[PDB]
Every structure is written in structure tokens, then in C-alpha cells.
């Protein structure tokens, strides 16, 4: 009858997905996190260093989290197979722990009673979607587990779609200047799988690998072989920026680029891709719900066919809203 | 014949204790850390965001860490009982993992072949020592496991000793404005045992409990019931400052306070307590080996009997040097 | 018939005083700042790194700043004597440049047409006020020029008043752990009058002198000779915290301290002094309009007569709201 | 007979140029700065938040700054014409105030007695030099006033030269992720000429214009029309990184790119361009004297003819050392 949502992992994304659900009237029926009990959940949800105090009521009772008088069941189980999703009636599940990324890992949610899973990160094998770019590729009859890609992919892909469709991208290389995240360390500590990521997050500019640019070629297949990139993690707690250097097939004077993006933002990519000519900086996008905000004045062209395009994204807040948008879209298709 | 040292936990303290050992000619025969293999140890030891590149050679071979041509065995075991300390001849062990704080937990090192253990943190029951204040209380014949207290206790106790012995402390309350540490989080995350400590370390001033002031009354028994305090964690990666507000029994004009501290620094507390009248800030003490650096100009008196005294400490580097000093002292007593 | 406000200095306080005026329905008729033209004022007012985008419309036309359709004259003169306050009909002027602090300096506003002046900083000779503590000492007949004291004094004085009147303060020493401000430097630079203040604000814990605690004894004369203190500037961009260590005459068990502050917050100091028992950190007070938020759990007592009390303040936002409250109060009295 | 140096502007570059002079045995005979007297110069030179305490003696007497027993005259004049350079016998002058960038402005140093001037910043008309790239274009007879370009240009040009001469650069776009500097603000403040630069430096990723990439085409004329770029200022106090995305004429497999850079670093560009394959982050280059350190592992190729190349630089320290190198080179040529 209605979209209902379960959240596994009540972290930055989990908690802000709940905020976005409340904002968009999406019913959340349960949250699972073995490291956060109901009373502690109230505290973590209510106070946020980055996005301020929750505007509304947050309480706990009867083993439940209660937000704006909406009662939410709280589970404390460590593995998807163990979560009693059936107890709250076959919800759509957001998998936002960061550690159950494969179809096999996520499918345990379905076994445990979930109707669908949205993995809030790229997956090695789950079908990947970026709202505004390829959500139409979703087939309810054949797909119960999907990925909403990464924050960076959701920033680049809408922009790349507009630029490629208007001018043709011959080749492009991306850099994201990216806020630090929960995977990083306060001071130099162990990060066996990726040594640089262990170094103090607040002290350093840290180069990092990312598949985000290549992932864009998954949701825009015409761009296979034509995009890749990397990241720098820097000492800001939220908001990131994509820096796309691309060679274009058709001449693209910068004024034409601006008109193409502005047209997309006003029309078919409204709410996903935005456009600004203001003298903005990263904090100006705290709480912004867009996937991608094109920065007209920040970019620079060498010539009509070789340009550097700049687009902002609140990697926490924009992405969380896209998770909710994908859920709502999936539900609209699954009737 | 000679002091030999094993380090359990190759973290901020573990690695800087190794630096201090190399600087002071103390032989380190082994390091244990299940999360850092020899090649990775080379990297973590060589590069440091806070204290710069190691000045010397760092290599690995034959399963060993080699620093300035000194070969160091590397073990990868998760529990003290499992570490083959016997294989490197009954070393003195630095327990710097942060999770084996009790006499019972640390005693497994002895069972595994260690001759002594120095816990690099306060212990609920191990005898506690602050160099320059009460190391004489150490008895080799009855004590195989000891604690070197905390960075903050090592800052406050030498100062409190000088002030109490000259003027008499009637009562005192301490605040430490303290750099963030590895126990904290880059962004708002779970900290069940202490909620505030979960909040983003780089964004916040964070109140925290600390037993450091009360611990001073353990090493200066005359001050039992007369000292306690608390902490603020702030967005700096290293160096902290003690803020001691105390009522004194004898009149203590600030000039007399300065002369007492200066006399102690030049004489019996040389190398432990230092004295400055310069316009210093926290970064000026990066790499400082003193336990406590009295800041003459920063303090303020209401009157001759009620004063606020300020003292700096490199919570990483000073403390690591005191660990080494305690080891050397213990060895000198144990012959 | 109505209060009208002119703002000299469109900085952090000037701009946030304008926000507070909009929030409280106070008519602002002019802003003077020689370094910010109308178009640039729009930008600086609309976007804020700390307090977010202005929720409303901001535009310029006809040499005026227009906020939520309210037309505001913009002047560009470098000295108070030169500002054409008469052109907007004898406004109450907020002096928030930071460089006209004396009665003599500020009085040039009056000669230029201002009805009254509120200096948004302590003054060497202008009478100082803290709302909720001594505004009733305002005398319209004789006080054309007043001072709203400092952010820190507005935090400490309400708390000091409650504690003194309930328990009697014998003596106290204050530390404020304080966010950096516009007077500080991004990297080590010149600060002739105060050397430590030149050192990089984002890298350092910086001791600083402040007259804030002594200033409390001016607005609460019964505390003359009983308070002083100092500051540490730390790497946060806004929100600060008072750390008051005091000796009390009457027995002051911490439970009794909490009931006294709670009662004050609910009654005579409502909207000025708040009370919390939550596990708060500095960012939880971004945008808070209170002068002082008592942190029950952060404080610690040595005994019934010697305690450390902790209270938060948004040094930008709370203080700006108090400027507006003082303006409104003065106006109601000048009738 | 010998090189003697005068420094105008005792800021980050002025002070670290003095450090580099001491390190390289270059005689500094005078420093001019109207905002820093001899006693204050001692303090600012001795203590450094970024690069640590000066390892040596620093004192003042007889109106002079004395470093390692070298007596340095201290002048306090506000304009180049007014500085008594003649009193110290026709020194080579480093113009590091940031406000005398043209040949016309800087030439007043010559009228005041200077032998030559090195502007420590790009100039609109003074010839620009990058050591290791085009110092041989220096012509003593006709060039009294020169520019050492920018920190960023000194990073990019050596790399661009190596890559162009080996593979041929068809076109390239540069981003520098750059530490904040003294021109920026601690909190949102006025920056009329460049609005984004006024926004809080420690809170924001800040896009900025830079002519650095185009400047490379001035010192490497064969690249005219083939390079431009932009900057992001981020919350680190020192060390920056160049991100060069270029299209290459000859096939440039990444292995061949590494051999070309490595060979340059070992030979013709030794001490200017370095090469590393370690997992480095920005703080690992604090105090590094190279203009450019190529980060082999950080870069990524889309294909053999389209690559992203990453190179580090200590924008303060490396550049200061290059100023000294240019002075010495000019002197050897003026003989
Ligand atoms: N923070 C961002 O900018 C961002 C943006 C897009 C996607 N993501 C992705 O979202 C996912 C979560 O990222 P995050 O930033 O919220 O990290 P996070 O650390 O803040 O949140 C992870 C949460 O999952 C909990 N958790 C850990 N193991 C669990 C388990 N077995 N079962 C249930 N809960 C568990 C943790 O207690 C924590 O609260 C990751 O895959 C991340 O890559 C993050
Ligand atoms: N950082 C400071 O300022 C400071 C000062 C004084 C004392 N201490 C104390 O020193 C101890 C370590 O602190 P830290 O800052 O170095 O933390 P840290 O996280 O940087 O180091 C801990 C190290 O121990 C390793 N480790 C974890 N579990 C282990 C296990 N079972 N066996 C072996 N190694 C293990 C970790 O891999 C890590 O390298 C703590 O008790 C701390 O309270 C810290
Ligand atoms: N920021 C705080 O936390 C805080 C709190 C309370 C009080 N104050 C005090 O308020 C006053 C301003 O502080 P601030 O933080 O807003 O500093 P600020 O630098 O942000 O604001 C100063 C403003 O005044 C402008 N200005 C400079 N000279 C001027 C002149 N002759 N005429 C007109 N305008 C001029 C500047 O362009 C700037 O916009 C200071 O006295 C400060 O001590 C600051
Ligand atoms: N800091 C860097 O990373 C870097 C690198 C390369 C080049 N530069 C350039 O070097 C120059 C200085 O940069 P900075 O970072 O040292 O800035 P800075 O603010 O730290 O130094 C400027 C110094 O010049 C002084 N000064 C100001 N006006 C003066 C005057 N008329 N006469 C004499 N002294 C005066 C100031 O007191 C200050 O000490 C600038 O042109 C800058 O673009 C900076």
C-alpha cells in the first residue's frame, strides 16, 4: 500500500536518510545498529555537528525510537540474516553499514524478510543507479538488490550526461576534492588496505583512489573507456567538489556550456542538477539536496574543446536524499 | 647486562617511544602489533604527520624492522599471553595498546617471558609513577608491573609538587585543554561509553572526564582530597595545556611562584619541569621532551593566595620520553 | 514612535545583528561600511560559512541593501563624524567596527545625528550592560553612549549572578576556551600589541588576556575584587565556553547548584541563561540565542565550597541577539 | 666580492628566505619591515607554527637582529624608495611584501641603493624565472629587476618541461589544491577584489583564480597557448599539490612517464624536481626544499595520451629556497 523503509547502519548516511525520509513523508518502520541502542539513537539523531539540531521531537520508549511522534522499531543485530525485517512487514531496506556491498551479502536482507535492498555505496555486482541519469534501467521483476552508487558518482554523472549529450565527451579525467569521512583517522593510525587513508585526516591533503569516475561509464554506457579519476581528501567535515577536465567533440564555448547546464537544471534534471553563478564556497552547500551544483565562475576553458568544469555536492546530505528518491522511484515502479 | 625493550602496540605512543629509545640509546628488541606488518611498520615509523620524517634509516628484511641498522623483531599476536617475549630474552615491555590496563591483563606479558611491564596509561591497580615526583617508590623486588600515569598527570604532578612544597596547596581544580587523540572520531560516530567523545573531533570543543588531577594525589599523597579536574578536547593534533586554579596556604605573590618554578627547573626537576617567559603557543612545544613547561606570562592571580597556573606539554612526545626514562630508571634500580 | 537602527561596521557582529533585527522585527534603516558596497553587502549577508544561507530575500538597487523587501540605506564613510545618520532620522546606532570604543570616539555618532550608541564591545569608560543582569542600571537622561560588554562577559555574568545570589562567591577565576575571530591570523603574522594573537589561528591553542571576568565585577558591583581570568583561543570558528572555578560561602552541593540555575533559566533569566543536562559539544550551540547555557554534566566539584562550572555561548549569535535586546530595552526606557 | 642580501617584508617568505640564507651560507645584511621592530623580529623568526623553532641563536641588540652571531640591520620604512639600502652597501634585495610587483614599483629599490631586485611573486612585466627551467634566460646587462614567479609555477614548470620534452604536451589544464595563506581570513571577512578569498579559510574549500599555469608558458615559451588552470584553497597551513591533466603527442605509458621524471630528478633537475613512489601525504613535505615532488602512485592515466600527473610542493619552504638559489645564480652571472 505504501513505501516502508528499514535502515541498516545508523551512521552519517543512515541518520541523514532518516532526516530525508521525515522531510519527504517516507515512513521508516525500523532501524538496525548493534552499536547504538534506542536512547543513544535519540542523542545521535538529535544533535549533529554538521547539519545542526533536528528540527522536531526525538524521544525513546518501549524499545522504540520516536521521531515527530512516528514510532520506529530498533533492532540490535550484527548481520543482515539476523535482522527481523518480517516483524515490521517486508520493508525496503537501506544497507548503509559500508560492509555488506555485494549481491550475496545484501541478499541476506531479503532472506530475512526485506522486499528490496538499496546499497548506499557502489557494489561490485549489484545494478547501479543514479537518479536523473538511468533509474529507468531498474526492473522490479528482476532486481531486488540495487546500488545508489557513490556521492561522487551522483555528482559527476548528471553533469557528464548533460555535457556528453550536448557536446560529446571524447575523454575526461576527474579529480574530487573531498571532505574527510568516518573511514578516516583523527591521528596517524592503521589503514592496512590503503596506507594514506590512515594518516591524520585533519592535518593532511590525502590522495585517494576512487572508482567514481569509471562508475559514471556504467550508468552512461556510451562513455565506456572515456572517464576515470582520483580523489584528494582534505580537512573539511562535509561538502565536496568535482573537477572534470574533458576534451569535447563539438566546439563548446563556455557560454554554451553554461546555457546547456542551466537548461538541464531548469527542466529534466530539476532537483538533481543545479546551476549557480555566485561566488560560492563549500560551506554554502551544507544541507543542499542537489546531487550536483555546477559552479559557472569556478571553471576554466583552455579553448572551445578542452575545459575544466566544477560542480559541488554535499556528499552527506545530497546523497542521502538520492537514496530516498531512489526508494520512492523503485516503489512507484513496483506496483 | 643491559636494558632491552619490547613494545606492544605500535601506535602514537609505541612509535614515539621507539623514537625516544633510538634518541637515548635504549635497545629495542621487539615490537608487537597484529595490525601492522614489518613493511607497513617501516612506513608508519618513517613518516609522521605531527613530528616529521624519521631522521635516520628505516627498512625491513627477514621479518624484521631495521632502524639505523638496529634489527628489531616483529610479532603479530593479538594477546599478551601469545607474544613470544622469551624469543628475544626477557625484555622490559611497554604496554601501549590502550586495552590491557590492569595488573591481571598486563601480567600475561610476564607469563609470556617479559621481565617487567610499563603500562603507558593510568591503571586501575598497577602502582603509578611520575618521573621527578615519586619514582623512588618503585621497588624491583615487589613490582613487576607499573603504570607511567597519563600525559596530563605527568604535566600537573611536577608543577603541583613544586607549588605545594613551597606554598602549600589547600585545594585545586584543573582543566586541560587537550589535543584530540586516536580514540576520537573524524565525524560524528559511535562512542557508547562516552557520548561526547563520538562527536567530530575536528569540529568541536568537547568536554571530557579525566582522572588525571586526582591521579596526582596518588603520587603526591599529601594532596589526597585536594585535587580534581576535567578536560576539553579541541581541534589540534598534538600538544596540550594544563590550567590549574588553586588556593594556597602561604602567600604566593606571582614573582615568588616564578622563582620557585625556575629554581626547580634549573635544579632537581631539570629535564622534567621547564620554565618560560616567552609568548608561546601550542605548536612551539611540538617535539619538546619536558613533562611540563610552565608558562609565566599566561597565568593570572586574583591575589596572593588564589591563582591560575598554566603549563604546556607535548602529550605525545614528552610522555613517550618519560616512558623511556622510567624504563631506564627501573633498570638502574633492578641491578 | 518606533525604534530604528543604524549599523556601523558590517562584519560578523554587524551582519548577525542585522539577522537578529530581521528575526525580531526591528527596523534597520542604514548600514555604514567603507569596505563593502551594496552589491557586496548582499553577498556577505546572504552567504555565511558558520550560520548558513540567509532564509529570505537579499537584493540591491538604488544604492540600497534590500532584505525581505526592507530597504536599507548604505553608507561608505570611514569615520563616525562623517556618517549621514540624519538622512535616516536619528537612529539608534550599533558601533560594531571594533575601533571606536571610548565615549569620546563613539560620541561623534551623536554629532552626526544618532540618537544613541551601543558599542558592541567593552568600553574603557562607557557604561557596560549585560541583559538579565544590570540593564535596569540604564539611565536615559545621562547615557547616550553605552556598551554591551563582550560575548564572554555576557556568558559569565548571568551565571555569576545566580551563583553569587544563591551561594555567595568568595572568589573565582575564569578561563574561556574561545573560538578564533577576525582579529586573528590564518598563518603566523604581525600582531605588535599582542604577539601570541599573530600566530596561526587554525594551528594553535593560544593563550590571551581578557578583561571579561573583571568586567563582570563592573556589572555586578558586589563582586568587585572577587573575579578575574584569561582565555585560550582554539581552532573552532564559532561557539565558546566559560570555565568558572569559584570558592563559595554557603554549602553548594552540585544538586543545589543545578536547582538554582534551572530555576533562573525558567524565570528571571529566561532567554538569557539556559540549562542542559545533555551530552553537548560546541557545535550544538551554533545559532543559539542564549547568552549562557549551563552544562550540568561537564562541571565538577572538589567539595561543597569549591567547584568548576561550565557554560556555553555562541559568541557571534547570542551576543548579536543581546545587542538587539539592549536596543529594544533602551528604546522602551527612553519614552 | 660577495653576495649580500636585503629582505623587504619579513613575512612567511621573508622569514623563511632568511632561514634558507642561513642554511646555504648567504649573507643577509638587512631586513626592512615597518610593522616588526628588532625585538619582535627575534620572536617571529625564532618561533614558527609550521616549521618549528629556529635551530640556532636569535637575539637583538644595537637596533640589529642577530642570527647565529650574524648582525643584521633592521629598517622600518614603509616604501622601497625610503629604505636606506646604501647604508649596507648595494645588496641584492628580495621584494617579499606582496605589494610592489611591477618593474616600476620595484625599481625604487634600485634608486635607494639596491644592486638587483628579486620579486618573490609573479610580476606583470618583470621577467620571470624558475630555477631548473629558464634561469639561463637571465641577462645581467638588461635585467636589474626579476621575478621568481609563484610557488605553484615553480612546482608545475619543472614537471611540464620534463613531460613536454619527452612526450610533447598538446594541451593541459592544472588544478592546485593549495594551503591557505596570509592573504586569506580566519572568519568570513572583506575581500573586495576577490569575494571567495574573504570566506573563512579554515572552514572552506575555496575556488580561486591563478595565473600560475599560464605563467609556465612564459618560462617555457614552446607551451604558449597550451596551458591554463585554477586553484582550490583548503584548510591546511602549508604544502600544496599540482594536479596536471594533459594530452600528450607521443605515446606515454605511465612506466615511461616515471622513467623520464626519475631521470630528470637524478640529473638535470636534481634538487629541483624529486621523484617518489611512497604513500605520501601533504605533511610529509613540510620543510622539503624541492620545487616539485612527483607522486608516482597518486597519478592516473586514462590512456597512453591522456594522463593526470600529481606533484607536491612546500609552497613556503621550497619557494623560499628557490629565491635564494636565484639570488646566488644571478650573482655568479653578474661577475
Ligand atoms: N559519508 C558520506 O559522505 C557517504 C556518501 C555516500 C555513501 N557513503 C557510503 O554509506 C555507507 C555508510 O557510510 P557512513 O559515512 O554513514 O559511515 P558511518 O561510519 O558513519 O556509518 C556506518 C554505521 O553503520 C553501523 N554499523 C557498523 N557495522 C554494522 C553492522 N554489522 N550492522 C549494522 N550496523 C552496523 C555503524 O554503527 C555506523 O553507525 C558506506 O558504504 C559509505 O561508503 C558515505
Ligand atoms: N596519544 C597520547 O597523547 C597519549 C599520551 C599518553 C598515554 N596514552 C595512552 O597510550 C596508549 C596508546 O595510545 P595511542 O595514542 O598510542 O593510541 P593508538 O591508537 O595510536 O595506538 C594503539 C596501537 O596499539 C595497536 N593495537 C591495538 N590492539 C592491539 C593488541 N591486542 N595487541 C597489540 N597491539 C594492538 C594498534 O594497532 C595501535 O597501533 C593508551 O593507553 C593511551 O591512553 C596516549
Ligand atoms: N565576533 C565575536 O565573537 C564578537 C563578539 C562580541 C563582540 N565583538 C566585538 O564586535 C566588534 C566587531 O567584531 P567582529 O567580529 O564583527 O569583527 P569584524 O572584522 O568581523 O567586523 C568589523 C567590520 O567593521 C568594518 N570596518 C572596519 N573599519 C571601519 C570603519 N571605520 N567604519 C566602518 N566600518 C569599518 C570592517 O569592514 C568589518 O566589516 C569588535 O569590537 C569585537 O570585539 C565580537
Ligand atoms: N606564503 C606562500 O606560500 C608564498 C609563496 C610564494 C610567493 N608568495 C608571495 O610572497 C609575497 C609575500 O607573501 P607572504 O606569504 O610572506 O605574506 P606575508 O603577509 O606573510 O608577508 C608580508 C610581510 O610584508 C610586511 N609588509 C607589509 N607591507 C610592507 C611594506 N610597505 N614594506 C615592508 N614590509 C611590508 C608585512 O609586515 C609582512 O611581514 C607575496 O607576494 C606572495 O604572493 C607567497
Nearest CB neighbour to B245, from listed C177, C196, C245: C245
The beta strand positions in chain C, using DSSP E, are 4-8, 27-32, 58-61, 64-67, 70-75, 92-95, 116-119, 145-147, 169-179, 206-209, 227-234, 240-248, 273-276, 292-295, 300-303, 306-313
Residue D235: Cβ within 10 Å count: 25
**B70 strand-pairing partners:** B67
Residues of C with CB under 8 A from a CB of A: 43, 47-50, 52-53, 278-281, 283-284, 286-287
Is ligand 1 within 6 A of the CB of residue A150?
yes
Residue B308 main-chain phi, psi, to 5 deg? -120, 120
**A8 strand-pairing partners:** A32, A95
Domain boundaries, given as residue ranges, for chain C: 1-148+316-335, 149-315
Assigned fold of A149-315: Dihydrodipicolinate Reductase; domain 2 (3.30.360)
Give the side-chain half-sphere CA count within 13 A for A29.
17
Round to whole Å and give the CA distance between A333 and A321. 18
Q: Residue C141, exposed/middle/buried by CB under 10 A (0-12, 13-18, 19+)?
A: exposed
Q: How many residues does chain D have?
A: 335
Enumerate neighbours of D (3 or more CB pairs within 8 A).
A, B, C
Residue D140: Cβ within 10 Å count: 12
**C176 strand-pairing partners:** C231, C242
Give percent helix, percent strand, percent coil of chain D, each to the nearest 5.
30, 25, 40
Superfamily of structural domain C1-148+316-335: NAD(P)-binding Rossmann-like Domain (3.40.50.720)
Is ligand 4 within 6 A of the CB of residue D120?
yes
Q: Is D73 annotated as a binding residue?
A: no
Residue C169 main-chain phi, psi, to 5 deg? -80, 120
Round to whole Å and give the CA distance between B265 and A60. 55
DSSP 3-state of B98: coil
Round to whole Å and give the CA distance between A183 and A206. 13
Phi-psi bin for D287: left (phi > 0), alpha (psi -120 to 50), beta? left
Q: Residue B59, exposed/middle/buried by CB under 10 A (0-12, 13-18, 19+)?
A: middle
Enter the C-alpha cell of residue A325.
Answer: 528518491
Question: Can you give the resolution of this entry in Å?
Answer: 1.7
Closest CA to C203 of D20, B320, B290, B179: B179
Phi-psi bin for B52: left (phi > 0), alpha (psi -120 to 50), beta? left
Which atom of ligand 2 is closest in space to residue B16's alpha carbon? 16
Ligand 3 centroid to C298 CA: how many Å?
A: 32
Round to whole Å and give the CA distance between D241 and D175. 8
Round to whole Å and give the CA distance between B39 and B59. 8
Give me the DSSP letters along D169-226. EEEEEEEEEEE--TTSBSSS---TT-GGGGSBTTT--EEEE--HHHHHHHHSGGGTTS
Round to whole Å and give the CA distance between A50 and A237. 7
Query: What was the experiment behind these coordinates?
Result: X-ray
Enter the C-alpha cell of residue C110.
Answer: 551623536
Helix (H) or strand (E) holding A28: strand A27-32
Helix (H) or strand (E) holding D119: strand D116-119
Sheet holding B4-8, edge to edge: B58-61, B64-67, B70-75, B27-32, B4-8, B92-95, B116-119, B145-147
Q: Which position has the grid cell 624529486?
A: D274
Closest ligand to C-alpha of residue D316 is: 4
Round to whole Å and give the CA distance between B212 and B208. 11
Closest CA to C27 of C327, C330, C304: C327
Round to whole Å and give the CA distance between D94 and D18. 10
Is ligand 3 within 6 A of the CB of residue C115?
no
Residue B128 near residue B122 (C-beta atoms within 8 A): yes
The CA radius of gyration of chain A, in Å to the nearest whole number, is 20
Give me the DSSP letters along A226-252. SEEEEEEEES-SS-EEEEEEEEESS--
DSSP 3-state of B83: coil
Closest CA to A186 of B170, B268, D29, B197: B197
Q: For chain D, what is the largest distance between any 2 Cα atoms, rounded to a whole number of angstroms?
A: 64
Q: Which residue CA neighbors atom 6 of ligand 1 most closely?
A: A151
Contacts of A19 (CB under 8 A, 6+ apart): A51, A54, A320
Q: Which position has the grid cell 628566505?
A: D17
DSSP 3-state of C120: coil
Q: How far is CA C29 from CA A206, C6, C10, C148, C332, in A?
A: 49, 6, 14, 21, 19
DSSP summary character for residue D26: P
Closest CA to D214 of D172, D186, D245, D182: D172
Alpha helices in chain D (DSSP H): 12-24, 38-46, 103-106, 108-111, 151-167, 212-219, 254-266, 317-333
Residue A106 near residue A119 (C-beta atoms within 8 A): yes
Closest CA to B232 of B180, B195, B280, B282: B180
- A185 with B182: Cβ contact below 8 A: yes
Round to whole Å and give the CA distance between B297 and A170. 64
Nearest CB neighbour to D43, from listed B48, B279, B283: B279
Residue B185 near residue B191 (C-beta atoms within 8 A): yes
Q: How far is CA C143 from CA C114, C218, D102, D260, D328, in A?
A: 13, 16, 53, 77, 65
Residue A152 near residue A240 (C-beta atoms within 8 A): yes
Enter the C-alpha cell of residue B195.
Answer: 557520548
Q: How far is CA C94 from CA A218, C8, C39, D35, in A?
A: 58, 6, 22, 31
Give me the DSSP letters along C147-197. E---HHHHHHHHHHHHHHHHH-EEEEEEEEEEE--TTSBSSS---TT-GGG
- C202 with D186: Cβ contact below 8 A: yes
Round to whole Å and give the CA distance between D294 and D54. 28
Q: Residue D222, exposed/middle/buried by CB under 10 A (0-12, 13-18, 19+)?
A: exposed
Q: How far is CA B200 from CA A40, A241, C256, in A?
A: 16, 21, 33
What torsion do the CA atoms of C118, C119, C120, C124 make, to the nearest 10 degrees?
-140
User: Is C21 in the active site?
Assistant: no
Smallest CA–CA separation between B36 and chain D, in Å?
A: 15
Give me the DSSP letters along C23-54. HHTPEEEEEE-TT--HHHHHHHHH--TTT-S-
Round to whole Å and give the CA distance between A24 and A323. 12
Q: Which residue CA neighbors atom 39 of ligand 2 most closely?
A: B11
Nearest CB neighbour to C279, from listed A43, A53, A286: A43
- A278 with C53: Cβ contact below 8 A: no
Q: Residue C308, exposed/middle/buried by CB under 10 A (0-12, 13-18, 19+)?
A: buried
Round to whole Å and give the CA distance between A225 and A231. 19
Round to whole Å and give the CA distance between D66 and D73. 9
How many H helices and E strands in chain A?
A: 7, 16
Closest CA to C223 of C178, C270, C271, C156: C156
CA C7 to chain centre: 15
DSSP 3-state of B92: strand
- B180 with A190: Cβ contact below 8 A: no
Contacts of C74 (CB under 8 A, 6+ apart): C30, C31, C32, C33, C37, C38, C41, C63, C64, C65
Round to whole Å and give the CA distance between C148 and A297. 41
Is ligand 4 within 6 A of the CB of residue D33?
yes
The CA radius of gyration of chain C, in Å to the nearest whole number, is 20
Residue C309 near residue C176 (C-beta atoms within 8 A): no
Round to whole Å and give the CA distance between D3 and D90. 10
Give percent helix, percent strand, percent coil of chain C, each to the nearest 5.
30, 25, 40
The CA radius of gyration of chain B, in Å to the nearest whole number, is 20
Residue C58 near residue C46 (C-beta atoms within 8 A): yes
Is ligand 3 within 6 A of the CB of residue C147?
no
Give percent helix, percent strand, percent coil of chain A, each to the nearest 5.
30, 25, 40
Q: How far is CA C201 from CA A290, B179, C186, C241, in A?
A: 33, 15, 6, 17
- C182 with D180: Cβ contact below 8 A: no
Residue A77 main-chain phi, psi, to 5 deg? -95, 145
Closest ligand to C-alpha of residue A192 is: 2
Chain A interface mutation, best of C36, C41, C43, C47, highest count of A Cβ atoms under 10 Å: C47
Round to whole Å and give the CA distance between D205 and D282. 16
Residues contacting ligand 2 via CB (< 6 Å): A 189-190; B 8-14, 32-36, 78, 96-99, 120-121, 150-151, 181-182, 315-316, 319
Helix (H) or strand (E) holding A119: strand A116-119
DSSP 3-state of C269: coil
Nearest CB neighbour to D192, from listed C35, C182, C198: C35
Contacts of D77 (CB under 8 A, 6+ apart): D32, D34, D83, D84
The answer to whether the A1-148+316-335 and A149-315 domains have the same CATH topology is: no
Smallest CA–CA separation between A74 and chain B, in Å?
A: 16
- Asked whether the CA dihedral C151, C153, C156, C157 is positive or negative, the reply is negative
Smallest CA–CA separation between D182 and chain A, in Å?
A: 18
Residues of B with CB under 8 A from a CB of D: 43, 47-50, 52-53, 278-281, 283-284, 286-287
Q: Residue C25, exposed/middle/buried by CB under 10 A (0-12, 13-18, 19+)?
A: exposed
Q: Which position has the grid cell 595488573?
A: B103
Closest ligand to C-alpha of residue D233 is: 4
CA D328 to chain centre: 15
Round to whole Å and give the CA distance between D156 and A61. 61
Q: How many residues does chain A have?
A: 335
Give ∠ CA A22-A322-C287 in degrees, rounded to 5.
55
Smallest CA–CA separation between A302 and chain D, in Å?
A: 6
The set of catalytic residues of A is: 151
Round to whole Å and give the CA distance between A111 and C239. 48
Which atom of ligand 2 is closest in space to residue B79's alpha carbon? 31
Round to whole Å and give the CA distance between D65 and D195. 38
Closest CA to C75 of C14, C15, C32: C32
Round to whole Å and give the CA distance between A198 and A188. 6
Residue D253: Cβ within 10 Å count: 13
Angle of helix C254-266 relative to helix C151-167, nearest 10 degrees, comes to: 120
Amino acid at each position: 500500500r505504501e513505501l516502508t523503509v528499514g535502515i541498516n547502519g545508523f551512521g552519517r548516511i543512515g541518520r541523514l536518510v532518516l532526516r530525508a525520509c521525515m522531510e519527504k513523508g517516507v515512513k521508516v518502520v525500523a532501524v538496525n545498529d548493534p552499536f547504538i541502542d534506542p536512547e543513544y539513537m535519540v542523542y545521535m539523531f538529535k544533535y549533529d555537528s554538521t547539519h545542526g539540531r533536528y528540527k522536531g521531537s526525538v524521544e525513546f520508549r518501549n524499545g522504540q525510537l520516536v521521531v515527530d511522534n512516528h514510532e520506529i522499531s530498533v533492532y540490535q543485530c550484527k548481520e543482515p540474516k539476523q535482522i527481523p525485517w518480517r516483524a515490521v512487514g517486508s520493508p525496503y531496506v537501506v544497507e548503509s553499514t559500508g560492509v555488506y556491498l555485494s549481491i550475496q551479502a545484501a541478499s541476506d536482507h531479503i532472506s530475512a524478510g526485506a522486499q528490496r535492498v538499496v546499497i548506499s555505496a557502489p557494489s561490485p555486482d549489484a545494478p547501479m543507479f543514479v537518479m536523473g541519469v538511468n533509474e529507468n534501467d531498474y526492473n522490479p521483476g528482476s532486481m531486488n538488490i540495487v546500488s545508489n552508487a557513490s556521492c561522487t558518482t551522483n555528482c559527476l554523472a548528471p553533469l557528464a550526461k548533460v555535457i556528453h549529450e550536448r557536446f560529446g565527451i571524447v575523454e575526461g579525467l576527474m579529480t574530487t576534492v573531498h571532505s574527510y569521512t568516518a573511514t578516516q583517522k583523527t591521528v596517524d593510525g592503521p589503514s592496512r588496505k590503503a596506507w594514506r587513508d590512515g594518516r591524520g585526516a585533519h592535518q593532511n591533503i590525502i590522495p585517494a583512489s576512487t572508482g567514481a569516475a569509471k562508475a559514471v561509464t556504467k550508468v552512461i554506457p556510451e562513455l565506456k573507456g572515456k572517464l576515470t579519476g582520483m580523489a584528494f581528501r582534505v580537512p573539511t567535515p562535509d561538502v565536496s567538489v568535482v573537477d572534470l577536465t574533458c576534451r569535447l567533440a563539438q566546439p563548446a564555448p563556455y557560454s554554451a556550456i553554461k546555457e546547456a547546464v542551466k537548461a538541464a537544471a531548469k527542466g529534466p534534471m530539476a532537483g538533481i542538477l543545479a546551476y549557480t553563478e555566485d561566488e560560492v564556497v563549500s560551506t554554502d552547500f551544507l544541507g543542499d539536496t542537489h546531487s550536483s551544483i555546477f559552479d559557472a565562475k569556478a571553471g576554466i576553458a583552455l579553448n572551445d574543446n578542452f575545459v575544466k568544469l566544477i560542480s559541488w555536492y554535499d556528499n552527506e546530505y545530497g546523497y542521502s536524499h538520492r537514496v530516498v528518491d531512489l526508494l520512492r522511484y523503485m516503489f512507484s515502479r513496483d506496483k
